[PDB]
RNA sequence: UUACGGCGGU
RNA sequence: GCGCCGCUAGAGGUGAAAUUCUUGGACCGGCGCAAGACGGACCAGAGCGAAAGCAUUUGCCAAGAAUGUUUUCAUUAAUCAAGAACGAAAGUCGGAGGUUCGAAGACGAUCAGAUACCGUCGUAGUUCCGACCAUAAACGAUGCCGACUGGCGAUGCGGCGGC
């Protein structure tokens, strides 16, 4: 009898100001009826959105998360929650006869945003190489992996979250641990595989409204 | 109070109602695990030593950890005389004559 | 000398009580009568008082532990997870 | 006029569509962009009365039609695809009702954005229900 | 827990072989109050107010304290002898660099 | 008779390998006897490529591939006919079949 | 090769065998004279060194022991002797 | 739901099929563009180049 | 999907 | 597995089907939490180990081959009755755990019969600790040490030499 799609109304979702496209899409939520208010029914919704429908030229194989932390009327304002690669890219780059190396480190920013970083990388077959296996030795891996997690430990612990995720769209971290490892063994598919969030710092409402600023 | 400790902690001697000065999971070796807080309508559930889960108040004060004296029922009484001494200190209940007899 | 060949501590029960039951006691009984190294003073003086109550011959410090043995394996699993939950997320 | 979001002619709204095309059944469940609010879940086994055909590609075809005829009815106009297999412990290939429920969703008036496979892959866990010598048919 | 804690206790048994030292509580308390003690090493096991005054005397004598991660029976075999020792004081390193280590 | 020089298995300087499980029948095989097949099948089923790209919101969209590794027991590798019985002299080669894509 | 005169090998073939297995065995080691930069002191250091060789007066490090054959620390004056 | 009963001309015949030699795969073209062309299976005698009428156009071909 | 047998000596 | 939401009547499972789970709202979707197992793809006719066997990171500990050697000792060796150490899986006793799987068992099916294959459920068990047991198609169905006797391409670890 009753239609539940009459008692719902459509909101619309905004991105942080560091992105070019600011308007993600349109979620929805039911209307307020007594206790069930229409403001906690949509906080904490994760919007698993890629870069290419969020930037003008940037690649599609990298997606982000963007939890809603606030509603300002019709708008549904978001903050960064994590990123990962799409799985088609994540296992297009895992081929045979190369050694895959990976690392992880738990770093907080200077802003109170304890993160967990995942980075991967692949040994590179050379351009005049004739032998089939471009394998690394285990002590070479243990010092590549020591050098990987050292660099992104710095480039999170430098400054606040806003410059760390902005580092992420560019995804330089992977280029920097590319350039700083190829005097140990040469690498070529060197990405930050997944970023996971662990802490929230008390939810100061002014910090969010700065991130949706100009 | 159990509203502040996080989920999956191990608790003994918890109050079954706020102020009761400690009633649930008290005997030697037992413990209770808290699960699934509810911050509005402040009331949490726990896991009792019988496996029966029970929703209680969120301000039930409770001591963290398991009771000392665990493993007590692993050793056999092993003879009738040490069961005499076991129940001499408790009650008058030990020699239980079968009702058929 | 090698006085007895299987029974050890439960030769005090003699020919009574069963074979599995005497075998079942002689792990618990060698455990409740042992002197353990005290974690607070280093000496092998943790001697069992009443059940669940463990006490030092010197430094005189009473630890409430397991019934037959000093560290119940269920107690160490809890303590290893309690200090995990204290530092993780900081309540 | 309670149903329908606020769109112009050219701008379109996205919702993700979960194509659970395992064996023995097929789901062509669609929901919103956050994945929380279910818009229209219809299942291939709800539109046959045969029970061999819960995972038939023809049941997946007309399940995709009704979910496109109800999505377009509401105001949601284009779909992201998040195809699953069974995954995890079981098989990791999609069933027979994967491509037909995806192709009929394109012929029956619906626009398609990002598609991506999202089946559960473990990091080596959870022994599989066969025994050791497998199922011996 | 794998390779290189032979900075602390393999330098310790080196001083045991070469240099000079005292073991035990009231020997170090004399050495630390006449300035001849260079580096006092406490156990993990020492009682909490005994630790609080040996650290406090080293604040007075401007000497270093190392908090040895190990038991008092574990520091004793790290010295290389069959005692238990909570507190020691080295007064003369042989040729190692315990003092010229991290503290 | 010993049929094959290696025993059907690529272990030489070992004693034990990981056991893996068959894909369709879930049978316990060692990792180096099992018939493996890595499949890079496109997820779009190429007959329906000019039916979704005209419903796409793009003008040149590179379709994702599907990345499935199969690995079979040999009891189901012959029955599903991914391998065929070979003659006793055409058998002593490890070379894979030619591809023939277009 | 039925008539290799295996009492008279060429010295090229003699160099490219093991240090054992030769017709008369002879080691691949040698001794080398090394002028450390800034002194008169010629050092007579062994080639496959295993110790860290230090100089006497200008007491800097001369060579490093490594896998087969010792790597000299500085690019330095150097000659093979006897 | 309601489809036009569409006619379509065949390209090259892909041989018999159907476990009795009863069905022929034909790959029709849909009379309005030759770029839109589905492979389908008919029974009976065919004659390359003629026109047959689909009662409903796109379901399925022969693939396991 | 189901498909089990076939007396002895020549 | 359990919370809290979303939408809806099926879900599951099979060659078919049924036992089963479900408007006290299952399957599905979302976010959280918990627990026990297990370390995918990289992973190979690669590697180590006496054999059994060993794959997630960083880290105390002790060991090992190989190579290098114009060091040392100077036959100390080889195989080995007796006697020892280690030994998959299952198994036993006791203690923690108990997700998955799962002997026994219960039922559904399929069958002329099904105490079997096939399905739902599931005990012992599989996991950790301690004590036992000493067998396997423990297999390269080839004992260990030593020497000599064709070639070629490749691999792995050291060493040396070069555009
Ligand atoms: Mg009685
Ligand atoms: Zn004591
Ligand atoms: Zn199989």
Swiss-Prot record, chain A:
Keyword presence, Transmembrane helix: no
Main location: cytoplasm
GO terms for MF: mRNA 5'-UTR binding; RNA binding; structural constituent of ribosome
Glycyl lysine isopeptide (Lys-Gly) (interchain with G-Cter in SUMO2) crosslink location in chain: 14
Residues with N6-acetyllysine modification: 14, 36
Heme listed as a keyword: no
Taxonomy, superkingdom: Eukaryota
Compartmental location: Cytoplasm; Nucleus; Nucleus, Nucleolus
Keywords from the named record: Acetylation, ADP-ribosylation, Cytoplasm, Differentiation, Isopeptide bond, Nucleus, Phosphoprotein, Ribonucleoprotein, Ribosomal protein, Ubl conjugation
Signal peptide positions (record): none
GO biological processes: cell differentiation; cytoplasmic translation; negative regulation of apoptotic process; ribosomal small subunit biogenesis; translation; translational initiation
Residues bearing the modification ADP-ribosyltyrosine: 135
TM spans (from-to): none
UniProt PTM: ADP-ribosylated at Tyr-135 by PARP1 in presence of HPF1.
A cellular component term, taken from the record's GO annotations: small-subunit processome
Oligomeric form and interacting partners: Component of the small ribosomal subunit. Mature ribosomes consist of a small (40S) and a large (60S) subunit. The 40S subunit contains about 33 different proteins and 1 molecule of RNA (18S). The 60S subunit contains about 49 different proteins and 3 molecules of RNA (28S, 5.8S and 5S). Identified in a IGF2BP1-dependent mRNP granule complex containing untranslated mRNAs. Binds with high affinity to IPO4. Interacts with DDIT3. Part of the small subunit (SSU) processome, composed of more than 70 proteins and the RNA chaperone small nucleolar RNA (snoRNA) U3.
Family indicated by similarity: Belongs to the eukaryotic ribosomal protein eS1 family.
Protein name, entry field: Small ribosomal subunit protein eS1
Organism: Homo sapiens (Human)
UniProtKB/Swiss-Prot annotation, chain B:
Cross-link Glycyl lysine isopeptide (Lys-Gly) (interchain with G-Cter in SUMO2): residue positions: 47
Keywords: Cytoplasm, Hydroxylation, Isopeptide bond, Ribonucleoprotein, Ribosomal protein, RNA-binding, rRNA-binding, Ubl conjugation
Primary localization class, coarse: cytoplasm
Keyword rRNA-binding: yes
Example GO biological process: translation
Cellular component terms (Gene Ontology): cytoplasm; cytosol; cytosolic large ribosomal subunit; cytosolic ribosome; focal adhesion; membrane; nucleoplasm; postsynapse
Transmembrane domains' residue ranges: none
Miscellaneous comment: This protein can be partially incorporated into E.coli polysomes in vivo, indicating it can replace the endogenous protein.
Function according to Swiss-Prot or TrEMBL: Component of the large ribosomal subunit. The ribosome is a large ribonucleoprotein complex responsible for the synthesis of proteins in the cell.
Family: Belongs to the universal ribosomal protein uL2 family.
Name the record gives this protein: Large ribosomal subunit protein uL2
Source species of the chain: Homo sapiens (Human)
Part of the full-length chain shown: 103 to 203 of 257
From Swiss-Prot, chain F:
Annotated GO MF terms: cadherin binding; mRNA binding; RNA binding; structural constituent of ribosome
Protein's cellular compartments: Cytoplasm, Cytosol; Cytoplasm; Rough endoplasmic reticulum
Keyword S-adenosyl-L-methionine: no
Region (Disordered): 84-102
GO cellular component: cytoplasm; cytoplasmic side of rough endoplasmic reticulum membrane; cytosol; cytosolic small ribosomal subunit; extracellular exosome; membrane; nucleoplasm; ribosome
Biased composition (Basic and acidic residues): 86-96
Domain of life where this protein originates: Eukaryota
Positions of modified residues (Phosphoserine): 53
GO biological process, one term: negative regulation of RNA splicing
Keyword Ribosomal protein assigned: yes
Keyword line: Cytoplasm, Diamond-Blackfan anemia, Disease variant, Endoplasmic reticulum, Phosphoprotein, Ribonucleoprotein, Ribosomal protein
Complex and partners: Component of the 40S small ribosomal subunit.
Record-stated family: Belongs to the eukaryotic ribosomal protein eS26 family.
Illness the protein is tied to: Diamond-Blackfan anemia 10: A form of Diamond-Blackfan anemia, a congenital non-regenerative hypoplastic anemia that usually presents early in infancy. Diamond-Blackfan anemia is characterized by a moderate to severe macrocytic anemia, erythroblastopenia, and an increased risk of malignancy. 30 to 40% of Diamond-Blackfan anemia patients present with short stature and congenital anomalies, the most frequent being craniofacial (Pierre-Robin syndrome and cleft palate), thumb and urogenital anomalies.
Function: Component of the small ribosomal subunit. The ribosome is a large ribonucleoprotein complex responsible for the synthesis of proteins in the cell.
Swiss-Prot record, chain H:
One GO term (biological process): ribosome biogenesis
UniProt cross-references to Gene3D superfamilies, sorted A to Z: Nucleic acid-binding proteins (2.40.50.140)
Residues with the Phosphoserine modification: 37
Compartment(s) where it occurs, according to its Swiss-Prot or TrEMBL record: Cytoplasm, Cytosol; Cytoplasm; Rough endoplasmic reticulum; Nucleus, Nucleolus
Keywords associated with the record: Acetylation, Cytoplasm, Diamond-Blackfan anemia, Endoplasmic reticulum, Nucleus, Phosphoprotein, Ribonucleoprotein, Ribosomal protein
MF terms in GO: RNA binding; structural constituent of ribosome
GO cellular component assignments: cytoplasm; cytoplasmic side of rough endoplasmic reticulum membrane; cytosol; cytosolic small ribosomal subunit; extracellular exosome; nucleolus; nucleoplasm; ribosome
Tagged with keyword Manganese: no
Broad class of where this protein is predominantly found: cytoplasm
Family: Belongs to the eukaryotic ribosomal protein eS28 family.
Function recorded in the entry: Component of the small ribosomal subunit. The ribosome is a large ribonucleoprotein complex responsible for the synthesis of proteins in the cell. Part of the small subunit (SSU) processome, first precursor of the small eukaryotic ribosomal subunit. During the assembly of the SSU processome in the nucleolus, many ribosome biogenesis factors, an RNA chaperone and ribosomal proteins associate with the nascent pre-rRNA and work in concert to generate RNA folding, modifications, rearrangements and cleavage as well as targeted degradation of pre-ribosomal RNA by the RNA exosome.
Protein name: Small ribosomal subunit protein eS28
Source organism: Homo sapiens (Human)
Source organism phylogeny: Eukaryota, Metazoa, Chordata, Craniata, Vertebrata
């Amino acid at each position: 009898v009753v239609d539940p799609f009459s008692k719902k109304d459509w909101y619309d979702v905004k991105a942080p100001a560091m992105f070019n496209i600011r308007n993600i899409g349109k979620t929805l939520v039911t209307r307020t009826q007594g206790t069930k208010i229409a403001s906690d029914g949509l906080k904490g919704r994760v919007f698993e959105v890629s870069l290419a429908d969020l930037q003008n030229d940037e690649v599609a194989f990298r997606k982000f998360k963007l939890i809603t932390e606030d509603v300002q009327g019709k708008n549904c304002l978001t903050n960064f929650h994590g990123m990962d690669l799409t799985r088609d890219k994540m296992c297009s780059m895992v081929k045979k006869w190369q050694t895959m190396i990976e690392a992880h480190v738990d770093v907080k920013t200077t802003d109170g945003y304890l993160l967990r970083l995942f980075c991967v990388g692949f040994t590179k077959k050379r351009n005049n190489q004739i032998r089939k296996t471009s394998y690394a030795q285990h002590q070479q891996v243990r010092q590549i992996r020591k050098k990987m997690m050292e660099i992104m430990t710095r480039e999170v612990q430098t400054n606040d979250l806003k410059e760390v995720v902005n580092k992420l769209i560019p995804d330089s971290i992977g280029k920097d641990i590319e350039k700083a490892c190829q005097s140990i063994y040469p690498l070529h598919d060197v990405f930050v595989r997944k970023v996971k969030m662990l802490k929230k710092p008390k939810f100061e409402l002014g910090k969010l409204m700065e991130l949706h600023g100009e | 109070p159990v509203g502040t400790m996080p989920e999956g902690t191990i608790v003994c001697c918890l109050e079954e109602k706020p102020g009761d000065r400690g009633k649930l999971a008290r005997a030697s070796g037992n413990y209770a695990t808290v699960i699934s807080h509810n911050p509005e309508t402040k009331k949490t559930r726990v896991k009792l030593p019988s496996g029966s889960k029970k929703v209680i108040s969120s301000a039930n004060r409770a001591v963290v950890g398991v009771v000392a004296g665990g493993g007590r029922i692993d050793k056999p009484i092993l003879k009738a005389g040490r069961a005499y001494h076991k129940y001499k200190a408790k009650r008058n209940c030990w020699p239980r004559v079968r009702g058929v007899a | 000398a090698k006085r007895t060949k299987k029974v050890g501590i439960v030769g005090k029960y003699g020919t009574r009580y069963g074979a599995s039951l005497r075998k079942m006691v002689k792990k618990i009984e060698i455990s409740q009568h042992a002197k353990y190294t005290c974690s607070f003073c280093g000496k092998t003086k943790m001697k069992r008082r009443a059940v669940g109550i463990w006490h030092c011959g010197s430094c005189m410090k009473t630890v409430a532990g397991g019934a037959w043995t000093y560290n119940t394996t269920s107690a160490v699993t809890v303590k290893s997870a309690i200090r995990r939950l204290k530092e993780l997320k900081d309540q | 006029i309670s149903l329908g979001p606020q769109v112009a002619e050219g701008e379109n709204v996205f919702g993700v569509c979960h194509i659970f095309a395992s064996f023995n059944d097929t789901f062509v469940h669609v929901t919103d962009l956050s994945g929380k609010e279910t818009i229209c879940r219809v299942t291939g086994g709800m539109k046959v009365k045969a029970d061999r055909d819960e995972s038939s590609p023809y049941a997946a075809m007309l399940a995709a039609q009704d979910v496109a005829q109800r999505c377009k009815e509401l105001g949601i106009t284009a779909l992201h695809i998040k195809l699953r297999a069974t995954g995890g412990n079981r098989t990791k290939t999609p069933g027979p009702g994967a491509q037909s429920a995806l192709r009929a969703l394109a012929r029956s008036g619906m626009k398609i954005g990002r598609i991506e496979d999202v089946t559960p892959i473990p990091s080596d866990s959870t022994r599989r229900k066969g025994g050791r010598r497998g199922r011996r048919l | 827990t794998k390779k290189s804690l032979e900075s602390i206790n393999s330098r310790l048994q080196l001083v045991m072989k070469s240099g000079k030292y005292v073991l035990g509580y009231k020997q170090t308390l004399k050495m630390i109050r006449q300035g001849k003690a260079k580096l006092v090493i406490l156990a993990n096991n020492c009682p909490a107010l005994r630790k609080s005054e040996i650290e406090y005397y080293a604040m007075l004598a401007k000497t270093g304290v190392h908090h040895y991660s190990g038991n008092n029976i574990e520091l004793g075999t790290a010295c290389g002898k069959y005692y238990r020792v909570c507190t020691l004081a080295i007064i003369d390193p042989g040729d190692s660099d315990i003092i010229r280590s991290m503290p | 008779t010993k049929k094959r020089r290696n025993n059907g298995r690529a272990k030489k300087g070992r004693g034990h390998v990981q056991p893996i499980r068959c894909t369709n029948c879930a049978r316990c095989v060692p990792k180096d006897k099992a018939i493996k097949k890595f499949v890079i099948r496109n997820i779009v089923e190429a007959a329906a490529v000019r039916d979704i790209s005209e419903a796409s919101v793009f003008d040149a969209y590179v379709l994702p591939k599907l990345y499935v590794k199969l690995h079979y027991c040999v009891s189901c590798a012959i029955h599903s006919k991914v391998v065929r019985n070979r003659s006793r002299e055409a058998r002593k080669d490890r070379t894979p079949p030619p591809r023939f894509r277009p | 090769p039925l008539a290799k005169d295996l009492l008279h090998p060429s010295p090229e073939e003699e160099k490219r065998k093991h240090k054992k297995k030769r017709l008369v065995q002879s080691p691949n080691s040698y001794f080398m004279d090394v002028k450390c930069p800034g002194c008169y002191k010629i050092t007579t250091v062994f080639s496959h060194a295993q110790t860290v060789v230090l100089c006497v007066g200008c007491s800097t490090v001369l060579c490093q022991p490594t896998g087969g054959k010792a790597r000299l620390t500085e690019g330095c004056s150097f000659r093979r002797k006897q | 739901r309601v489809q036009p009963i569409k006619l379509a001309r065949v390209t090259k015949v892909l041989g018999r099929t159907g476990s009795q030699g009863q069905c022929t795969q034909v790959r029709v073209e849909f009379m309005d563009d030759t770029s839109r062309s589905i492979i389908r299976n008919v029974k009976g005698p065919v004659r390359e180049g003629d026109v047959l009428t689909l009662l409903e156009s796109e379901r399925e071909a022969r693939r396991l």
